[PDB]
Amino acid sequence: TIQPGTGYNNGYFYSYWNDGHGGVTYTNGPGGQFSVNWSNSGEFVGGKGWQPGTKNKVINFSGSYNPNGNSYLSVYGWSRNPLIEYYIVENFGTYNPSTGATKLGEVTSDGSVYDIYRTQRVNQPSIIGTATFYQYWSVRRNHRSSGSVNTANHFNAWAQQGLTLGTMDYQIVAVNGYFSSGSASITVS
Ligand SMILES: O[C@@H]1[C@@H](O)[C@H](O[C@@H]2CO[C@@H](O[C@@H]3CO[C@@H](O)[C@H](O)[C@H]3O)[C@H](O)[C@H]2O)OC[C@H]1O
C-alpha cells in the first residue's frame, strides 16, 4: 500500500491521487499490476502506465473491476499546452460520465463503437495546480474489464473533431472514483 503521489514500480509509472477524504487503498503489485479497494471514498484516481505517454501507444489491460457507485475504468492521462485531462472509458458504475454532455463524434476501435464528448472543469485540481480546463472522452458502448486500446484511433478521432492535444504527460490505466465503494485488480502492459 502506498501514499498518494507518483513514481515507478516494477518497471511501470504509477500515479495515485485523492482529495484527502479517506476510504481508499491503492496497492502496487508485480509487473504491471495494481489493485484498488475503497469504501465510502471521496474523489480519487490511480493506476499504472507511462510517463510520458505517446500518441500511438497500444495499451493492454486485464483483470476484475467491481464498482459500487460512481467509478470509471479508463485509459487516463494528461497533455500540457493545452492542458487537457482525457479518458478512454472502458467501463463504469452508476454514472456514464458523458451524461448531459455534447456528443462530438463516434470512433470504432478495438471491438466497439465509442461516443466522443468534451466537458469542462472549472477551478479544479490538475497536474499544474488549480485550473479551468477541457476534458476529452471516448465512452465505450460495450463495457469490459480486459482488452487492448489503440490510443491513436482515439487521439486521431479527437483531433479530427477539433479536440487537439498538446504535449503528453502521464498516461495510465486507471480506476476513478467519486464518493463510492468498490474493488478492482488490473494488470497493464
Ligand atoms: O501535488 C500535485 C499533485 O497533487 C497533482 O496531481 C494531479 C492532481 O489533479 C488530479 O486530477 C483530478 C482527478 O480527478 C478527476 O476526476 C479531476 O477531474 C481531476 O481534477 C490528477 O489526477 C493528479 O495527477 O499533480 C500536481 C502536483 O504538484
Swiss-Prot record:
Parts of the chain that traverse the membrane: none
GO terms under cellular component: extracellular region
Active site positions: 85, 176
Catalysed reaction equations from the record: Endohydrolysis of (1->4)-beta-D-xylosidic linkages in xylans
pH dependence: Optimum pH is 4.5-5.5. Stable from pH 3.0 to 8.5 at room temperature and from pH 4.0 to 7.5 at 40 degrees Celsius.
One MF annotation (Gene Ontology) recorded for this entry: endo-1,4-beta-xylanase activity
Pathway in which this enzyme or protein is active: Glycan degradation; xylan degradation
Residue span(s) of domain GH11: 1-188
Listed GO biological process terms: xylan catabolic process
Main location: secreted
Keywords: Carbohydrate metabolism, Glycoprotein, Glycosidase, Hydrolase, Polysaccharide degradation, Pyrrolidone carboxylic acid, Secreted, Signal, Xylan degradation
UniProt name for this protein: Endo-1,4-beta-xylanase 2
Shown segment, full-protein numbering: 35 to 223 of 223
